[PDB]
């Protein structure tokens, strides 16, 4: 995604308003840029954050913030890759993982969530201890 594509997917008015909400001295921190990206429905990972940081440092001008948002687009995202990641841990091929198991996965590798973030993400999907991870991934991409 370049900025032109980005501004067909998100509303530029929101992009600007959210920048104004968080900016200081005409610039926005990467943490606040990621917060804005999420509000706009985008899903940055640490890969995207480290990329923009290498280019511009941790405090972005408006145009650099636009370039960051374009990096956050991720058109190739899909449910299948997520299900397959969880299915890796589903040895008995039940289609289920417990909340404890999913919490472990989410808080151990990659851009690890805190225990509370993981608990809150899981409890929000289901009151029950056994999670149909296929249904969970469909819901997370909703």
């Amino acid at each position: 995604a370049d900025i032109q594509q980005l501004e067909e997917k998100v509303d530029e008015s929101d992009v600007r308003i959210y920048f104004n909400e968080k900016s200081s001295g005409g610039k926005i921190s990467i943490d606040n840029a990621s917060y804005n990206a999420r509000k706009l429905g985008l899903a940055p990972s640490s890969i995207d954050e480290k990329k923009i940081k290498e280019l511009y440092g941790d405090n972005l001008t408006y145009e650099q913030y636009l370039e960051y948002l374009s990096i956050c687009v991720h058109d190739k995202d899909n449910v299948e890759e997520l299900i397959k990641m969880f299915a890796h841990f589903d040895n008995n091929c039940t289609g289920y993982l417990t909340k404890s198991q999913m919490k472990n996965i989410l808080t151990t590798w990659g851009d690890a969530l805190t225990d509370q973030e993981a608990i809150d993400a899981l409890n929000a999907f289901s009151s029950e201890d056994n999670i149909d991870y296929k249904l969970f991934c469909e819901d997370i991409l909703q």
């Binding site: 985008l42 899903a43 890969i47 851009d111 969530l113 973030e117 993400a121 991934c137 997370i140």
Partner: peptide
Amino acid sequence: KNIPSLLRLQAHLRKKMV
């Protein structure tokens, strides 16, 4: 293993919680 896909999942969880 499968780290890229895990990062995408964690990214969507952070998105949804925002």
